[PDB]
Design a protein around this nucleic acid. Structure first.
Lengths: 122, 117, 57, 206, 117
RNA sequence: GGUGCAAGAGCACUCAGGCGCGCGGGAGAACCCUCGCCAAGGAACUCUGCAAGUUGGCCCCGUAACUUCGGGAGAAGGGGUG
RNA sequence: ACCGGAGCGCUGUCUCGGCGAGGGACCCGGUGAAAUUGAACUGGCCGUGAAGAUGCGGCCUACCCGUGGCAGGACGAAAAGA
RNA sequence: GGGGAGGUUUGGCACCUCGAUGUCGGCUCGUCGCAUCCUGGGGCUGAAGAAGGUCCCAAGGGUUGGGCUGUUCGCCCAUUAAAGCGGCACGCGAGCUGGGUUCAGAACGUCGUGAGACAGUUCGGUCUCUAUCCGCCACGGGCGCAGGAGGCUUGAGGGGGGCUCUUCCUAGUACGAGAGGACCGGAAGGGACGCACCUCUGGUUUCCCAGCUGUCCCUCCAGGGGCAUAAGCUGGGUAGCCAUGUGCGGAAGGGAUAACCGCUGAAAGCAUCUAAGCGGGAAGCCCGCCCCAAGAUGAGGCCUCCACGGCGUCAAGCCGGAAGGACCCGGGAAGACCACCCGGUGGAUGGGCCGGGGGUGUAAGCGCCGCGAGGCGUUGAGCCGACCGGUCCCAAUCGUCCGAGGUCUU
C-alpha cells in the first residue's frame, strides 16, 4: 500500500511496462495508496510504434504486494505491481487487460469495465 | 523494561555457562560450598536439574549429563552414590542459607549452599 | 566549561548534609544462647536454625 | 448501571457474517455495603465489593465497619455516583441489555521512566551528516533574554505510564447468564488480572 | 480460573467441534472451496487449487499463507475453523522436514526445481 | 615449530614457554559510545549517495570507441567449486 | 588517496521509526581531585532607572530540606579584542 | 492638494557594552498579535440561478510533497478548502551541523617600475567530557490540620481536548427563452491528528530447537564439548516491547452576547429598534465530556475498632494497646534509590515436580538394504526460556522498638 515514488508495471497499453509514481490523489496529504486509488503517473520506458509516448497520465492501482485485511479475514496478496491507464475521466485505452484474475479488484466500484475484462489465469 | 522475563544476568553471555558448570563440578564433589547470595539463589535451577536426570536411568541420561560435566569420574560417582538416595522425593534437593558476616574489602553478604539429606 | 559562581555558605553547606545520617542495624538474640545476632542468619557462636551446619565440629 | 470487574483477554469469535474482535471480562457478583443519600452529604452511591480473601487476615475496624450491612470480607471497595439498588446484591443479567453502548475505566500499564521519543512522540536529530552526540533528545527549551525563564506547561522527559485512563462508547455484544462473563468489542485498558469498572453512557446521541 | 479455564467456555460454542476437515499436513497440495458472497446477495462458491506453505497454532488457527503460480504468484491466507468454507480436499502428500515456514519457493521460482523439493 | 586453505612471515585453532592487564559487589531506568537484523518504497535525506551496504579467491568462455602499436582489459557480462 | 555533472546495481541516509547484546551512567563498601568565587536570608509580570533589574515602586503567587534529568537566564567560564 | 497611526524596512544621532554581549542559512522545539489565506455569521450591487466585487464582525482549528542555487527571496511541475503576514537580541550554536563570506597555500583577468592589491571569479581549510543559584519535567524525608489509627470520598482551582471534505433521497424542480442549475433539511464512506491494546497482518526475540565448515581436546570408530563478534555462519521462533495492524474520539444540549434585524414607544399626539421595557442572533465566552487536586495554614465529609486503672494538691516523668506499627525476609504487569502493592507456615509468595498450551521437526541404539557416501522401519519421536494451572519436596525459623493515658471552660 506504499507508493510515494515507485516503479510499477502497466499490464496494458503503452509499449513497455514501466511508470513513475508522482502523487497520490486524494485530499492534500495522503502519503500512501492502496488499490482502487487513481494516481497521477509518468511513463518512463519506451513505446514502439506509439500511443502514449513520453507524457504523463493517470492510472488505477491494481495489486500491491501487501495485505488486504479483508472483512471476513482472508488476505489476497500477489508478488508484482501494476496499474491500468485511465483516459481523462474513466475509461481504458483498449479492450484487453492482461495481468491476473478476480479476487475482487472491483473494490473502488467506480470501475466495472476493468473487472468485466480482467479475464483469467494470465 | 524488564517485564515478565526471568533468569537474571551476571557477567557476559558465555562466561555464565562456564560459571554454572564450574560451580556445579565443585558442589557435587564436596557436598557444600560458599558463594555470594545472588550467585546462589539461581544455581539451584541447574544443579537440581542434573540430579533429576541422574536417577532417571539409562545411557540417554548419562550421555546427556556428560555434555554438562565432561568428567567420566564425576558421572560414575554421581550415578551410584547420590542418585540412589533420592528415590523417595519429588524435587527440591538443595538448600541455601544466609551467613552472618560480610565480606570486608567489598562488603557483600555470603550464602552457604549444600544438598540435603 | 560549566564552571560555578559564588561559594556556598556554611549555613547551606551544612543543610544538604542534614539528610545523610545513617541507621543502626537490627539485632535479636539467638534463642539457644544469650546474645545478639542479625535476625535471619546462622549464629556464629550457638549454631543453628534446626540442625547445625557450621561451627567447629 | 455499574459493575466491578476483572479483565482477562482479548479473543475473537465470528458472530455475524464477519468476525468481530472482543475482550472477555468477569463480574462475580458484588455485594453493596453502604448507601448515602440525603441529609449530610451529596455523593450518593451504593458501594460494591470484590472477591474473598480469607477472613482472619483482617483488622477489626473493617470487621465491624463492614458487618453493619454484613457482607463477608473484601479486598477492594469502590464508589460510582447516582444509582439506586432495591436489594442486597447486583448481578450481571439485570443491567446490561445485549446491544447497549457502555464504557470502561481502568489503570494503564506503567512504562516506567520513558523518554521524550516515547512520551511526547517528537523527533530527534539526524544520523549521518555529522550528528555529534545527539540522536534522540530534544532541541531548545526557550528563547533568549526576553522571558528569562522556561514556560511551566512544557513537554519534557520524565515519568510515564500508570495513570488512570478511560475509554468511551463501545458495545456489549453478548453476555452469558450461566457464568458471569461479559463480552465487549474494544480495547479495555490494563494489564490483565487488574481491576476495571464498567458504567454506561449512551447519553451521547448521534 | 483464568484464561485456561474460562475462555474455552467461550470459544467452545464455535470450535466445540471444528466441522472437522482433516489432516493439514505441512507441504501438500490443496483445493479450497470458499463462500465468496457479494453483488446484491449472490453467493459464488469458489474453488482454488494451490500449494500450502506455513501454519501456526493457538486454537484460533490459520491454515495460512498458501501460494500458487498463475504467472504472477498469488498467495492467500485464510482461517481454519471459520464459517466461510464448505470443505478442504487434499490431493497428494509431500515431504521434506524443514517444517512450518518453508519460503524458499518464493524466489526459487523455477518449477523445474520446485519438483525436486 | 604443527595441520587445512592453489602459495606465503597473511587469516583460524593450537605445541614448548609465559600470562588473566593492582579496586570490588548488585540492579538491570532516561541518555551517549562500539555492534546485529527489519519491511512495503529504493536517494524522496542532503551543501554533496557523506557514512554504511552491495559484488570479493581460483578456473573456462567472451570482450567496444580511440591509440604515441606497448596499451585500453581484472573492460563490461556470464556460467563452475562439496 | 585531485575538482564538476549523468545513469545502473544494492542499501535505516530518508517517508518513520522499532526491538536486542556488551562497556558507562544508577545503588552499596575502599581511596578520593580541578578550573570558578565581594558577601547571600538568590520568585513572576507592568513601569522607571547610564535607556533589557532576584536587590527600587504597586499588585498576584509561594509550608522547611533533598535525590535523578533538560539547558532559557545569571549581559555565565577561559583569552588586559587580532 | 491636506491630516494621522504603526516600529516590520535603507537612513539620522552616538547614550551602556573593546580586562570579549560568537555570524547569514539549515535542523529540533515553539508560544504570541491582527491591519484575515481557508472554515463559520452578516449588509450593498451595474446580485434572475450557480458563481463573483468591496466592506463589518471573528483568533477555536489548519496551512502539502518536489527540480535548480550557499540561500532568506524568486521563477517552475503536480495537487488542494487554502497552499497567509508579522514580533519573540533580523527567537533558538553551555541543543547539533559548517555549504556561504574575508585566517595562513595556489592560479586566471585588470591596475602598479615594484613589494603587493581589488563586495571581480575559482579549488582546499581544528566549533571545548563533570550545572553551584533562579526556571522546568517526575518522585521522596520531617513537624503541621490540637485524644491515636485504618477506609471510602465532595470539589474551590488548574490543565488537556476543539478539524475538514466528497457522493447520494430532497430533484433536478424554484430560477431562467435556453444553455445551465440551488437555499432549508437528511444518510453513508474518507483524509490528517490524539489517548489506549495484542486477537488477526507484519518486526525483534544473545542461547529455545535443528543443519554445515576448519582446528585442538574427551579415548581410538560412534557420540559430544571450547574458540573462530562483546552470537562462528545460515534456516525457524513462544510470552515481553512496539508499529507498516485493530477499538474509539472530537459532539448533542443549556445560558449570555458580537456585526445585523425587530416589537410597543415618549421628549419629536405624518415618525423613529430607546437611556423606560422585551425578543432573535456565530467554529468565539461560561457550564457540560475525560485527568490531577484539602500543603484550599479558609488545612475539608461521613461509617467502624480499643478508652481498664490511677493518683500525696502541679500530673508537659514510668512499663504500657483485641487499637495499630517500623526494622528483617520470599516477591511483583510497580520501580534509577526510597514510594506503592501482595505474602510470612491455621501458607500456595518464588525455586523444583506433575498435567496441559506452544516451539522446532521425525533423537541415541539395535535390526534390515548398498562394496562406500548414505537409505528404510521403532517414530508427528526427543529436547523443551518466562504462558495457564494442581503438589507443605526447599526456602519466609525465632524475635525487636515506637504509640493514646482526648487539652482553655461550664
Amino acid at each position: 500500500m506504499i507508493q510515494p515514488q515507485t516503479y510499477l508495471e502497466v499490464a496494458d497499453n503503452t509499449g513497455a511496462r514501466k511508470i513513475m509514481c508522482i502523487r497520490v490523489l486524494k485530499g492534500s496529504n495522503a502519503k500512501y495508496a492502496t488499490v482502487g486509488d487513481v494516481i497521477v503517473a509518468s511513463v518512463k520506458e519506451a513505446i514502439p510504434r506509439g500511443a502514449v509516448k513520453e507524457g504523463d497520465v493517470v492510472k488505477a492501482v491494481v495489486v500491491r504486494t501487501k495485505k488486504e485485511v479483508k472483512r471476513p479475514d482472508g488476505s489476497a496478496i500477489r508478488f508484482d505491481d501494476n496499474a491500468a491507464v485511465i483516459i481523462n475521466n474513466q475509461l481504458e485505452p483498449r479492450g484487453t487487460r492482461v495481468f491476473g484474475p478476480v479476487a475482487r479488484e472491483l473494490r473502488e466500484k467506480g470501475f466495472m469495465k476493468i473487472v468485466s475484462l480482467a479475464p483469467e489465469v494470465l | 523494561r524488564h517485564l515478565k522475563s526471568g533468569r537474571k544476568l551476571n557477567r557476559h553471555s558465555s562466561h555464565r555457562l562456564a560459571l554454572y558448570r564450574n560451580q556445579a563440578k565443585s558442589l557435587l564433589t564436596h557436598g557444600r560450598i560458599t558463594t555470594t547470595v545472588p550467585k546462589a539463589k539461581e544455581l539451584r535451577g541447574f544443579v537440581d536439574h542434573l540430579i533429576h536426570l541422574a536417577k532417571r536411568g539409562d545411557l540417554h541420561a548419562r550421555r546427556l549429563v556428560l555434555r554438562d560435566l565432561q568428567d567420566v569420574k564425576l558421572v560414575r560417582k554421581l550415578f551410584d552414590e547420590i542418585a540412589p538416595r533420592y528415590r523417595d522425593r519429588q524435587g527440591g534437593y538443595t538448600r541455601v542459607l544466609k551467613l552472618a558476616e560480610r565480606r570486608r574489602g567489598d562488603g557483600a553478604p555470603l550464602a552457604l549452599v549444600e544438598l540435603v539429606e | 566549561h560549566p564552571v560555578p559562581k559564588k561559594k556556598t555558605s556554611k549555613a547551606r553547606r551544612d543543610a544538604r548534609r542534614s539528610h545523610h545520617a545513617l541507621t543502626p542495624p537490627t539485632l535479636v538474640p539467638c534463642p539457644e544462647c544469650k546474645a545478639m545476632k542479625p535476625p535471619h542468619t546462622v549464629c556464629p557462636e550457638c549454631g543453628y536454625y534446626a540442625g547445625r551446619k557450621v561451627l567447629e565440629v | 448501571m455499574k459493575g466491578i470487574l476483572g479483565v482477562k483477554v482479548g479473543m475473537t469469535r465470528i458472530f455475524r457474517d464477519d468476525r468481530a474482535v472482543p475482550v472477555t471480562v468477569i463480574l462475580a457478583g458484588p455485594c453493596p455495603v453502604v448507601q448515602r443519600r440525603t441529609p449530610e452529604k451529596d455523593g450518593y452511591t451504593a458501594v460494591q465489593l470484590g472477591f474473598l480473601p480469607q477472613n482472619p487476615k483482617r483488622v477489626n475496624r473493617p470487621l465491624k465497619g463492614h458487618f453493619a450491612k454484613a457482607g463477608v470480607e473484601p479486598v477492594r471497595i469502590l464508589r460510582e455516583i447516582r444509582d439506586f439498588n432495591p436489594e442486597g446484591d447486583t448481578v450481571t443479567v439485570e443491567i446490561f441489555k445485549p446491544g447497549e453502548r457502555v464504557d470502561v475505566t481502568g489503570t494503564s500499564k506503567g512504562r516506567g521512566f520513558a523518554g521524550v521519543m516515547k512520551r511526547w512522540n517528537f523527533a530527534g536529530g539526524p544520523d549521518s551528516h555529522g550528528a555529534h552526540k545527539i540522536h534522540r533528545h530534544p532541541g531548545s527549551i526557550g528563547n533568549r533574554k526576553t522571558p528569562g525563564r522556561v514556560y511551566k506547561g512544557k513537554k519534557m522527559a520524565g515519568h510515564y505510564g500508570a495513570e488512570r485512563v478511560t475509554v468511551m462508547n463501545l458495545e456489549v455484544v453478548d453476555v452469558i447468564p450461566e457464568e458471569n462473563l461479559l463480552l465487549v468489542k474494544g480495547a479495555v485498558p490494563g494489564p490483565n488480572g487488574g481491576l476495571v469498572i464498567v458504567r454506561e453512557t449512551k447519553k451521547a446521541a448521534k | 480460573m483464568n484464561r485456561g479455564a474460562l475462555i474455552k467456555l467461550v470459544e467452545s460454542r464455535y470450535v466445540r467441534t471444528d466441522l472437522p476437515e482433516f489432516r493439514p499436513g505441512d507441504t501438500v497440495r490443496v483445493s479450497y472451496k470458499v463462500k465468496e458472497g457479494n453483488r446484491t446477495r449472490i453467493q459464488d462458491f469458489e474453488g482454488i487449487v494451490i500449494r500450502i506453505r506455513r501454519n501456526g497454532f493457538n486454537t484460533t488457527f490459520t491454515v495460512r499463507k498458501v501460494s500458487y503460480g498463475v504467472g504472477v504468484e498469488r498467495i492467500f491466507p485464510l482461517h481454519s475453523p471459520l464459517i466461510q468454507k464448505i470443505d478442504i480436499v487434499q490431493r497428494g502428500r509431500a515431504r521434506r522436514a524443514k517444517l512450518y515456514f518453508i519460503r524458499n519457493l518464493s524466489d526459487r521460482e523455477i518449477r523445474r526445481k520446485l519438483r525436486a523439493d
